[PDB]
Each structure stands twice: as structure tokens, then as C-alpha cells.
Amino acid sequence: EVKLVESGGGLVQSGGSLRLSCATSGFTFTDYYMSWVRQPPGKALEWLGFIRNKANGYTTEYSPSVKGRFTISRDNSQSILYLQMNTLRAEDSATYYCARDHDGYYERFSYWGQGTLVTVSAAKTTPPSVYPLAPNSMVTLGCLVKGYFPEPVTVTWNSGSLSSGVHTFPAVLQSDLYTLSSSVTVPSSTWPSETVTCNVAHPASSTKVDKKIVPR
């Protein structure tokens, strides 16, 4: 199975530098060009650059938008792709994806990573507060994940075993902090008799929280 996994995203100040990585497996890495693409929240994809395959000498090309400022490189022993970013500004805040590119035949990006979020800001890292939301044949519970920076957070329920009936509401920025919420709806016959727990992570602050929803 082909795997592409980006890492290195996070909070950085205006003018600073950051290097992203993209670990790959499941294909002959040196056979392929690799691209970097970014996407500001709610905006279009933007191609940034590629590094060619072995047959083409692993040479690089860049969008005019970032040429001179961003550098792509690759480790052909470990099959890892890199993106070095310099003199970062607010406009560089975006999800960054690596994508498998050309192999000398096909014109396509066959595979994409899950993406890593970069936030360029002067604001400090603030961990979320996580609060339980407790109150038919059906019952709705939730978790309020309040007052964190930067994005993202992840929310699962019962370590992912409850995914059906889950709605996670996109974060909203108010007074320099994000807040999000997540609802889960289960048969009333199963709660509180069975446990329901939201699992929240905030990678920027390495925060890991399990909040059991307890009847009031």
C-alpha cells in the first residue's frame, strides 16, 4: 500500500523558517517526481514546486510565488521528501501536502498525504479547555473544546469506535483563540449505562485529554 505522511507543521512567527517532511513507502521512490501543494483554509490548492526523479537528476522547479524562498530536497535512502520554507508570512498559513508526481510516463498526482497545517502568527500556543456536554430513543452528548491556539485539534469518541452519528463543528476564531465543539448521538439505552468519552488532542501543546461524559 502507498503511504505519504507529512510532518513538521505548527506555529511559527512572521519572518521565521520551518522545514516540513513527507515520509513515503509502497512505491519505488527514486522513480518518481514529488510535488508540494498548499491550501489556505477555505481556499484553492496552489502548486509550489517539484523535485524530479533519478532519471532527471533530481532537479527542482518552483512556482514563481515561492522561488528563492522555498527549497525542496529528498533523501533517496529513506524515501523522505522535504520542504524548507524561509521568511514566512501570514499568507503562507496553509495546509501543506506532498503528492506523488510524474514517473516519466503518466501525467497525474496519484497519491497525496493527509497534510500538515502551518500557522504564521505572533500569538502564543494556548492549550484547549475541554468541557463535557451532558443533558427519547436517541440522546445527544458533546464536548466543547474552548480557547486554543493554533489549529488544529483532533476529536474522536470512544477512541474512534463511535464515528457514526458524530458531528464535529469547524473551529471559529474569536478574540485570538479558537473554539470548537463535537456532538455524538447514541441510543438512550446505551448511555449512561455504557461509557461515552471524547478524546481530544492539540498537537501544538502536546495536549491529550479524555473526557468522560457523566450524567449530571
Binding site: 502548486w47 498525504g113 463543528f169 465543539s181
Partner: protein
């Protein structure tokens, strides 16, 4: 340079109907040496990475449903979805690879469905929050259509620090959900008894009212 433009910006279509969207390049994408059009289509569902659907303008990637068809040549390309399904909700991007690579601006496809009333739930502040000096009250308005909805907060019967957030459309039932959070200080929270969220949606001339009273907690 190569400018990629897409149309429409967005549209909504009912399950089982045909979808048509277009992609224009500022230069022909027809490579004269290989005689193929270097134009691909990607689908990006909410919260996901883009996924390859079509390349060389008309070659459908393995595993991609037959309902997706790419067509066109030179400067104009079309992605057609026959008998659209609830799961096809996504932003669709075209991308040229004739000269480096450039993406179009995307077309957002939403799904039209029958009107559906929200299910509304209200949640009082937790003791773990109140201890800190804050008091957030939350209402979930779940599984409704269309997207437009009004929420009013009433405290002791009069209208009132509100954070509203809508989900992207659901991939299974084509509904929306919204969360509304009213945040007060603990001091202000303790001055009043009744907390009400009122949802008015086109599905009823009667607002859906959910309330709790602080004395009952």
C-alpha cells in the same frame, strides 16, 4: 503563464441527477509529441486530501466510479457526473501539467435534498468550566436542510458572546448541522435562571425551543 479557471464556483444538485462543470486553460494543454491533454481532475471531500479522479483529460483512474467522466481538449475541459450520489459532495479541481503545474480555483458541489427540520439540544455549563469563572451554554441544531437557520438566545425570557459554526454537508444524508455557543461570565450567569435557544427554520412557522433553568441543575 498558464491560468486555469473553473466554472461554476458552486452549485447544488439532487441525488440521481447529472452534474456538469468546466475547466479552461489560457493555453492549449494538448502536447503535440504525446498527443494527450495534460489535464487532471481531483476531488476533495470535506476534511480530506484531494483524490485523483481523471487524468490525460479523459482517463478514469482505477477504483473511481464509472459515473465520473472527463472530456474536452485544448483549452476547454468538462467533468460530468451522471446520477450523482450523496457522497459526491466535494470541491473538484482541474490541474494542468503541460508546463510545471497549476490548479484551477475549484467548483464546490453541494447536494440538494428534501427540507428537514433540525433536532435541537441544549447543554448547561459544566462545573469544570464554572470553577474557572466562565459559563458557556451550547445548542446543537442537528440534521437539517436547507442550510439557512436562525438561532436566538433568551435569558430570563429576553433576547441576548455568541459563537456559531456550521458543519459541511453530511456525505450520507445531505443535511447540515450547526452549533451555537453563548458565553457569559460566571457572575452574569448566576444572575439569571432561564436559558433558551430558539431555532427558526423554514420547515416550521413554530420555532423549536429548548431551555433549561439554573435552579433545576
Amino acid at each position: 503563464d498558464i491560468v486555469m479557471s473553473q466554472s461554476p464556483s458552486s452549485l447544488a444538485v439532487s441525488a440521481g441527477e447529472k452534474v456538469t462543470m468546466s475547466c479552461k486553460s489560457s493555453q492549449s494543454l494538448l502536447n503535440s509529441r504525446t498527443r494527450k491533454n495534460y489535464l487532471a481532475w481531483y476531488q476533495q471531500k470535506p476534511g480530506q486530501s484531494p483524490k485523483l479522479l481523471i487524468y490525460w483529460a479523459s482517463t478514469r483512474e482505477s477504483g473511481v466510479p464509472d459515473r465520473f467522466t472527463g472530456s474536452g481538449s485544448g483549452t476547454d475541459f468538462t467533468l460530468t457526473i451522471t446520477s450523482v450520489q450523496a457522497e459526491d459532495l466535494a470541491v473538484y479541481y482541474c490541474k494542468q501539467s503541460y508546463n510545471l503545474r497549476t490548479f484551477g480555483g475549484g467548483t464546490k458541489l453541494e447536494i440538494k435534498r428534501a427540507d428537514a427540520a433540525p433536532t435541537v439540544s441544549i447543554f448547561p455549563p459544566s462545573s469544570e468550566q464554572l470553577t474557572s469563572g466562565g459559563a458557556s451554554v451550547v445548542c446543537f441544531l442537528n440534521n437539517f436542510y436547507p442550510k439557512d437557520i436562525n438561532v436566538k438566545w433568551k435569558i430570563d425570557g429576553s433576547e441576548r458572546g455568541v459563537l456559531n459554526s456550521w458543519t459541511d454537508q453530511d456525505s450520507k444524508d445531505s443535511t447540515y448541522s450547526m452549533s451555537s455557543t453563548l458565553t457569559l461570565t460566571k457572575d452574569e450567569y448566576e444572575r439569571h435562571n432561564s436559558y433558551t435557544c430558539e431555532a427558526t427554520h423554514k420547515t416550521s412557522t413554530s420555532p423549536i425551543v429548548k431551555s433549561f433553568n439554573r435552579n433545576e441543575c
